[PDB]
Structure 1
Amino acid sequence: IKLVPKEVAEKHLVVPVNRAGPSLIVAMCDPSNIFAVDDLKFLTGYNIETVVASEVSIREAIERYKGPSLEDIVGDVGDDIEVTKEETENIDEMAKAADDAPVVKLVNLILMDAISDIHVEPYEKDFRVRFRIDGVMYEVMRPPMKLRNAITSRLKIMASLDISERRLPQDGRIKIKMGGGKEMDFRVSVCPTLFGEKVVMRLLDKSNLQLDMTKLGFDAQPLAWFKEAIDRPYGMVLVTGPTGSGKTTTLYSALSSLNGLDTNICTAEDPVEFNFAGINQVQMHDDIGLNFAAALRSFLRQDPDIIMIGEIRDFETAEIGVKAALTGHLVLSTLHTNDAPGTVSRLLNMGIEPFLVTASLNLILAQRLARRLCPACKKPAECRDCNDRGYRGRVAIYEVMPFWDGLKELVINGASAAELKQEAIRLGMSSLRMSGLRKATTLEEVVGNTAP
């Protein structure tokens, strides 16, 4: 950083903070003051790029002063994520005492560099976002090639992967310590992306959505009761949907909403995404050199009443899953696809038959994203798998609920009460009916009240 005299910075409450693309970045509290700006233009002889900042933050930076950082970087005990953030931070403060001998609490940037849609398309392109109310808007954040590359490795690494010219695209997930997740697509160099490196982030933010999401109009209360039922007698279900229609959220919602306190549940994920407020539960995560099948195969082995597979992507695990369904477990999982040939095709192509999946799969929800300009809508577009047919086309499917987008409504389409009868008896069937019509937003509390 450089200004004219330190006194001038303090008097005018402005501070240069970099030089990029022949221009001096100047953080300025009073950008309407043409006298001060023209004074800086004349005294530096440099073309300016103005950035507005809060007065006291500028003053603080003037007195504090990319150098203090150039040294705190060579401190391995800082980047280490194995260390709790609470302590790590302390080291950065005490280490910063080196220069001026105080503790600075809350260095915004020093922390900002150590500790619903973000579109980052190329080099020197302003980031775009999807705002909860404003939708697609441009942003005041741009990175040239060097900064892009640095972001790109940053995000890649925090998501746990190693993007390079050898492996230029990367479709991972960031786990925010607040347990929250986000889907990250990312590209290094320009080999796939001529416009330069680039990244996209579809933010989750979690702590997991509940059945309180008949607020969000996604699934009608009636259908959620039918699923509540369904999940109690161990009907197996797969949530299908195109990318980011809500598969994982919906799944986690259905398991979370049920009282699972009296049943042993039992989950296998490539990374954590599933939060459950339940005690009898074993959470299992793929580690180095393990296939999904290793964990499912060895897990079905114990006695799970319910098995949750984050998402079927090696179908050698898929196979174990539908096998689990045929012994009579309650299995649930997610699949990337948009309709019935999508899934069935997708499921059959590592060697499970539709007799085994469709015959032992009970229900298949289909999730969507509907957009009407700036509303962001996630809806269950629609599916009861009856079984197989001898001499056939196979997959016998009875569509219970469709979603009409024109009126944003869920219609019942030829489902009858005689369909969902599938009960071992009269008292069981009666219990289903009561839950049908007879059967607080936080997951902990919601689970708490489905428990009862």
Structure 2
Amino acid sequence: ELKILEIIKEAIELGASDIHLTAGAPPAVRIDGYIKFLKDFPRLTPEDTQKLAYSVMSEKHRQKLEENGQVDFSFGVRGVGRFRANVFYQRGSVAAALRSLPAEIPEFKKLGLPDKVLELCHRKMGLILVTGPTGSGKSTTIASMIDYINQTKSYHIITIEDPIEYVFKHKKSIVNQREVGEDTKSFADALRAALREDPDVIFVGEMRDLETVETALRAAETGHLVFGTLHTNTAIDTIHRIVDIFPLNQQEQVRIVLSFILQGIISQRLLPKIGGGRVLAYELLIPNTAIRNLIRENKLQQVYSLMQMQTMNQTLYKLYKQGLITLEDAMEASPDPKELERM
């Protein structure tokens, strides 16, 4: 009767985002943001949610659920696509929460970014940054850029992910994708090796460690175009954030580096549309003659003024000068009420 290899069917048939298997309820499913218990066939599940859970768990996983009452892993079904699971000892039993992994990568056009971004991928070496609150298109924006490359250039692209969100088909180039925690054990002892694996483009899924940003930066300035992703929210704060987290025995030299190596910056926030709902706000900073020198001299604040590539407001407005984002959401996402309200 009960088979996870089939529970996933009725879920993918309804278009669920997440499916949850607990102990007292019948397999559940998250649809349109709601939790609905699919009693369609399965009945209140027994503490043998451990049975279904194993019909997916290897051994380095099943034993891991024992050291600590939980495991975070990804597995693939030849049926539909790939899923992300997280089994854990819930209330003296076993509970699982399978998510879903993107089988297809979006056409950069569909994203929303300008036709300027597709030029960054065409650079030769530097530090392309994509920042925003968790849930703002970062992953997608990156996979569209890394995939645009994989299509038009003859490179060996190397990505260090946790977990591998999007996957890549070998096209005009050879892609190598290592999952931090399954293929290596860190972004460092993986980015460290990326250095000596002849990769043309490196990719760190997350850069919240000194040593990580340390190398992400040493690599960016050694011949490779690296893509990094901080959780900031604006341009000014980004470049600021990375230089600040460095001992002050050369916080300026770092400003110097971040000025010779910074290839681009694109912060994002996913606001709603009076359509289906998704549209994207953002701030794009493409260094020039002045800002380059500015950053180094740290005449920061003043650089924001030269920004006639596009402040977050010249954008928070541009979406409304048409009829998409309402005035309040153009504020509940606006990095500054003051800058706007004058439009």
> Normalization by structure 2: what TM-score?
0.63
Q: Which residue of 1 aligns with 2:117?
A: 227
Q: Residue 17 of structure 2 is aligned with which of 117, 124, 142?
A: 117
The RMSD of aligned alpha carbons is 4.6
Residues 277/288 of structure 1: CA separation in 2 closer, same or farther (3 Å cut): closer
Q: Are 1:283 and 2:180 an aligned pair?
A: no
Residues 369/376 of structure 1: CA separation in 2 closer, same or farther (3 Å cut): same
Q: Are 1:204 and 2:114 an aligned pair?
A: no
Say whether the 8 Å CA contact 2:112–2:279 is kept in structure 1: no
Correspondence 1:160-239 to 2 at 5 A: 164=65, 166-177=67-78, 180-190=81-91, 198-212=95-109, 214=110, 218-220=111-113, 223=114, 225-234=115-124, 236-239=127-130
Residues 380/159 of structure 1: CA separation in 2 closer, same or farther (3 Å cut): farther
**Rg (Cα) greater in structure:** 1
Say whether the 8 Å CA contact 2:88–2:96 is kept in structure 1: yes
In 1, Cα distance between the equivalents of 2:163 and 2:60?
10
Say whether the 8 Å CA contact 2:85–2:96 is kept in structure 1: yes
**Cα shift readout 1:336-380 (whole Å, capped 9, x = no counterpart):** 555565896588658796627743233233344445799463635
Q: Residue 253 of structure 1 is aligned with which of 144, 150, 156?
A: 144
Say whether the 8 Å CA contact 1:165–1:189 is kept in structure 2: no
Q: Which residue of 1 aligns with 2:159?
A: 267
**Cα shift readout 1:392-442 (whole Å, capped 9, x = no counterpart):** 668966562645476446x9x9xxxxxxxxxxxxxxxxxxxxxxxxxxxxx
In 1, Cα distance between the equivalents of 2:265 and 2:60?
30
Residues 183/294 of structure 1: CA separation in 2 closer, same or farther (3 Å cut): same
In the alignment, residue 247 of structure 1 is paired with which amino acid? K
Residue aligned with 1:254, SS? helix
Residues 261/348 of structure 1: CA separation in 2 closer, same or farther (3 Å cut): same
Residues 204/288 of structure 1: CA separation in 2 closer, same or farther (3 Å cut): closer
Say whether the 8 Å CA contact 2:4–2:55 is kept in structure 1: no
Q: Which residue of 2 aligns with 1:362?
A: 263
Say whether the 8 Å CA contact 2:4–2:52 is kept in structure 1: no
In 2, Cα distance between the equivalents of 1:119 and 1:337?
31
Correspondence 1:286-305 to 2 at 5 A: 290-301=185-196, 303-305=198-200
In 2, Cα distance between the equivalents of 1:154 and 1:181?
15
Q: Which residue of 2 aligns with 1:420?
A: none
Q: Count the aligned residue pairs.
A: 290
In the alignment, residue 263 of structure 2 is paired with which amino acid? N
Q: Residue 297 of structure 2 is aligned with which of 378, 390, 393?
A: 390
In 2, Cα distance between the equivalents of 1:267 and 1:281?
11
In the alignment, residue 245 of structure 1 is paired with which amino acid? S
Q: Residue 334 of structure 1 is aligned with which of 207, 224, 229?
A: 229
Q: Which residue of 1 aligns with 2:211?
A: 316
In 2, Cα distance between the equivalents of 1:336 and 1:370?
17
Residue aligned with 1:379, SS? strand
Say whether the 8 Å CA contact 1:163–1:188 is kept in structure 2: no
Say whether the 8 Å CA contact 2:61–2:71 is kept in structure 1: no
Say whether the 8 Å CA contact 1:180–1:207 is kept in structure 2: no
In the alignment, residue 265 of structure 1 is paired with which amino acid? I
Residue aligned with 1:236, SS? strand
Return the structure number with greater helix share. Answer: 1
- Percent identical: 23
Residue aligned with 2:65, SS? coil
Q: Which residue of 1 aligns with 2:13?
A: none
In 2, Cα distance between the equivalents of 1:129 and 1:110?
16
Return 5+ residue gaps in structure 1 as ranges.
1-16, 18-65, 67-108, 414-452
Say whether the 8 Å CA contact 2:128–2:262 is kept in structure 1: yes
Q: CA deviation at 1:319?
A: 1.6
Which segment is superposed worse, 247-256 or 287-296?
287-296
Residue aligned with 2:117, SS? helix
> Normalization by structure 1: what TM-score?
0.50
Q: CA deviation at 1:251?
A: 0.7
Return 5+ residue gaps in structure 2 as ranges.
10-15, 335-343
In 2, Cα distance between the equivalents of 1:247 and 1:304?
22
Q: Which residue of 2 aligns with 1:241?
A: 132
